[PDB]
């Protein structure tokens, strides 16, 4: 999209020295003990994002045994017959935290509050009806 590729890095964590001094004062973190420090804030260098997106190469085309699949799908469905579903109008959805990111390219002009707050119920129901075709 743009002329130069961005390289994103991941900074290290922050240290709470007072609590560490407390905990060693009360006799923790002994050598050879069982409880210890194993959970840290690992840092990453430049080509971190792409080196993790590359992990999709483990996804390969897979052909399934169609008959046994057509049976187990029925059994799985039977595991799921105590609930109730169906479409609902725009004026019945429940959004917790209307203040998260709105993906791209919409994140150039505000959070999800904007788009959930600038489209009347008619526009939302019209969008649903549109994607139904």
């Amino acid at each position: 999209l743009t002329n130069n590729v961005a390289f994103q890095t991941v900074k290290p964590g922050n240290f709470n020295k007072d609590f560490y001094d407390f905990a060693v004062s009360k006799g923790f973190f002994k050598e050879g003990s069982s409880v210890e420090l194993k959970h840290f804030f690992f840092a990453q260098d430049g080509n971190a994002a792409i080196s993790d997106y590359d992990y999709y190469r483990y996804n390969l085309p897979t052909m399934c045994d169609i008959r046994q699949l057509l049976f187990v799908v029925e059994v799985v469905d039977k595991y799921f017959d105590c609930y109730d579903g169906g479409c609902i109008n725009a004026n019945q959805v429940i959004v917790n935290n209307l203040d998260k990111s709105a993906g791209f390219p919409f994140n150039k002009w505000g959070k999800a509050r904007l788009y959930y707050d600038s489209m009347s119920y008619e526009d939302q129901d019209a969008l649903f009806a549109y994607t139904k075709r």
């Binding site: 009360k26 006799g27 002994k30 050598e31 050879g32 003990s33 069982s34």
Partner: protein, 523 residues
């Protein structure tokens, strides 16, 4: 006769060529002609033989002038608590190329640490001896089955001894300057301590001044606890034999008598903890001695002064609040009045009446089972005494045993062993005792003149702006200062916080209230 010390364990039957046989009993008998040895040139010296040498039954009770004793008496151990660490080992038997001896496998200390080590033993060669790895197998006992998987998880020994020095060093660097091991099956542990102990004349550290308790083989240098990194030998441990003290069956049944806390998860540290728990019981659950002293490590004298201040203040306040006729003191072995002047009738009780002042100090062992219906006049005062549920009138101050600090050390059974000066042992903490009372809420009562300049009353006494609602010290109205009262309030608040962070909890009869102190104030 013979002993088992250095008892060979090789399977070959032929004796050794006299020139390579360590003793006159481990030679072969063709050379044995009338107790003497004769070289028979018809046979030569072997050039390949690997005889394991068992290392049990060491028996060390010598008297040399430069060297310190390794087994200490009971009193020399009572003095040096803070430094006790349990110890237990698990074994394994030798298999193919030898049989008849045990090798250390799992080690366990009073701390909950468990180290496993590959089986190694002392082998001979036609040129020298050798510390090498040997094959082994667990004991055929069924309960020892939790040892089968461990035989492939070992560590080379040098790693193990470094880890041991380091664990000890950061367990004890702030408490003692030595270490005394409490142990049970004395023999096998003494056998195991060949791997990482070295004894010798007393020495002082390098680049520090305290006595040295570490040894490094590479650099050949000693160290204290603080400056000991990379060193791998304990230089002068001390020991103790608990079972020596007149005990009968296994320590399991013996410990099971009192402490119902320490169960037995099947390891070695469990045995270590049980041994130390028992040793603490045998010497400390009795009555507290006043002749034993301990050094301060450290800051303690602040806690003591704070306890003084808070005792004085709280008792004075309770008296002036309710004006009790008689003050039923309890648990005071020295008839010393806490508040110095108090018209109230002042008793003294104890379960240990001294010689003098016994006429004052009536013998009394309190228990709510019986004396519950006896002292229903005035109010008691259980300063640091330890009974069961207290009577609905009292002013108890009892040390919580759940807190963590380097002052109180784990004891039995769940109750911990405080150590300030003379070691106090307190029973386990529980709520059922205080079912009649309520936590004393903080306050500060003063009763004296004020700043000065004015030295009269409203309103010429110096005011600064302290706004707090609990310093009940008329003169006080919101500006509430009279300097004196103000910085005194600051000091006493600091002291109260330090005391109650050290571990002590307070309680008062349910009838208490602060307002009547104000009512006293109106003059």
């Amino acid at each position: 006769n013979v002993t088992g010390l250095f008892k060979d364990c090789s399977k070959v039957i032929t004796g050794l060529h006299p020139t390579q046989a360590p003793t006159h009993l481990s030679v072969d008998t063709k050379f044995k002609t009338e107790g003497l040895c004769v070289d028979i040139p018809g046979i030569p010296k072997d050039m390949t033989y690997r005889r394991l040498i068992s290392m049990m039954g060491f028996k060390m009770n010598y008297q040399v002038n430069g060297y310190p004793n390794m087994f200490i008496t009971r009193e020399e151990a009572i003095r040096h608590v803070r430094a006790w660490i349990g110890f237990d080992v698990e074994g394994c038997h030798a298999t193919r190329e030898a049989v008849g001896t045990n090798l250390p496998l799992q080690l366990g200390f009073s701390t909950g640490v468990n180290l496993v080590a590959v089986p190694t033993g002392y082998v001979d060669t036609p040129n020298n001896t050798d510390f090498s790895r040997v094959s082994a197998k667990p004991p055929p006992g069924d309960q020892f089955k939790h040892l089968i998987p461990l035989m492939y998880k070992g560590l080379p020994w040098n790693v193990v001894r470094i880890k041991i020095v380091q664990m000890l060093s950061d367990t004890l660097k702030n408490l003692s300057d030595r270490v005394v091991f409490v142990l049970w099956a004395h023999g096998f542990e003494l056998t195991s301590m060949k791997y990482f102990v070295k004894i010798g004349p007393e020495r002082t550290c390098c680049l520090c001044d305290r006595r040295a308790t570490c040894f490094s083989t590479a650099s050949d240098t000693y160290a204290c606890w603080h400056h000991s990194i990379g060193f791998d030998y304990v230089y002068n441990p001390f020991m103790i034999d608990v079972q020596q003290w007149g005990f009968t069956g296994n320590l399991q049944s013996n410990h099971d008598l009192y402490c119902q806390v320490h169960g037995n998860a099947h390891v070695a540290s469990c045995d270590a903890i049980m041994t130390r728990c028992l040793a603490v019981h045998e010497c400390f659950v009795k009555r507290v001695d006043w002749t034993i002293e301990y050094p301060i490590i450290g800051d303690e004298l602040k806690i003591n002064a704070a306890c003084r201040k808070v005792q004085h203040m709280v008792v004075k306040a309770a008296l002036l609040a309710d004006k009790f006729p008689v003050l039923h003191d309890i648990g005071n072995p020295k008839a010393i009045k806490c508040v110095p002047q108090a018209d109230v009738e002042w008793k003294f009780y104890d379960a240990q009446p001294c010689s003098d002042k016994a006429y004052k100090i009536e013998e009394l062992f309190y228990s709510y089972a019986t004396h519950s219906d006896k002292f229903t006049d005035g109010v008691c005062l259980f300063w640091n005494c330890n009974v069961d549920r207290y009577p609905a009138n009292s002013i108890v101050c009892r040390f919580d045993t759940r807190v963590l600090s380097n002052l109180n050390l784990p004891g039995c059974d769940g109750g911990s062993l405080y150590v300030n000066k003379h070691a106090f042992h307190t029973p386990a903490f529980d709520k059922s005792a205080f079912v009649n009372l309520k936590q004393l809420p903080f306050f500060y009562y003063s009763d004296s003149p004020c700043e000065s300049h004015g030295k009269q009353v409203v309103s010429d006494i110096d005011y600064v702006p302290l706004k707090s609602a609990t310093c009940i010290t008329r003169c006080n109205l919101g500006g509430a200062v009279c300097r004196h009262h103000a910085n005194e309030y600051r000091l006493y608040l600091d002291a109260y916080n330090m005391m109650i962070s050290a571990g002590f909890s307070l309680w008062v009869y349910k009838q208490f209230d602060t307002y009547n102190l104000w009512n006293t104030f109106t003059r």
